[PDB]
């Protein structure tokens, strides 16, 4: 994760939004978190009308989103995502973010 795509490199609402003013139904990119100012960052992705906000879980350099902060990477986590699909971490409903945005 030198610099990833979906992600540009941790920026703000302004840039964020900016692109998901209304680009695809179910966009996703990174967001520049707080926590001592260093890393963990924050996931955004357009609803089609909304941002929704998650947080990321990390806590010496790996991350939390699936295995017990077990793994490291997120490229390889998100990859293996955006083949499939986020069941929103719960049945009943589910929705793809095959719609990322960037400058590459």
Same mark, same amino acid.
């Given at each position: 994760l030198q610099d990833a795509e979906w992600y540009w490199g941790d920026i703000s609402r302004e840039e964020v %939004? !900016?692109?998901?003013r209304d680009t695809a139904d179910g966009t996703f990119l990174v967001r520049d978190a707080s926590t001592k100012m260093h890393g963990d960052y @924050?996931? @955004? *992705?357009?609803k089609g009308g909304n941002n929704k906000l998650i947080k990321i879980f990390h806590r010496d350099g790996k991350y939390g989103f699936?295995?017990? *902060? @077990?793994? %490291?990477?997120?490229? !390889? *986590?998100? %990859?293996?995502?955006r083949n499939e699909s986020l069941a929103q971490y719960n049945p009943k409903l589910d929705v793809k973010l095959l719609y990322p945005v960037s400058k590459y």
């Open positions: %939004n !900016e692109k998901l @924050t996931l @955004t *992705l357009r699936s295995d017990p *902060l @077990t793994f %490291n990477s997120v490229v !390889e *986590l998100i %990859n293996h995502y």
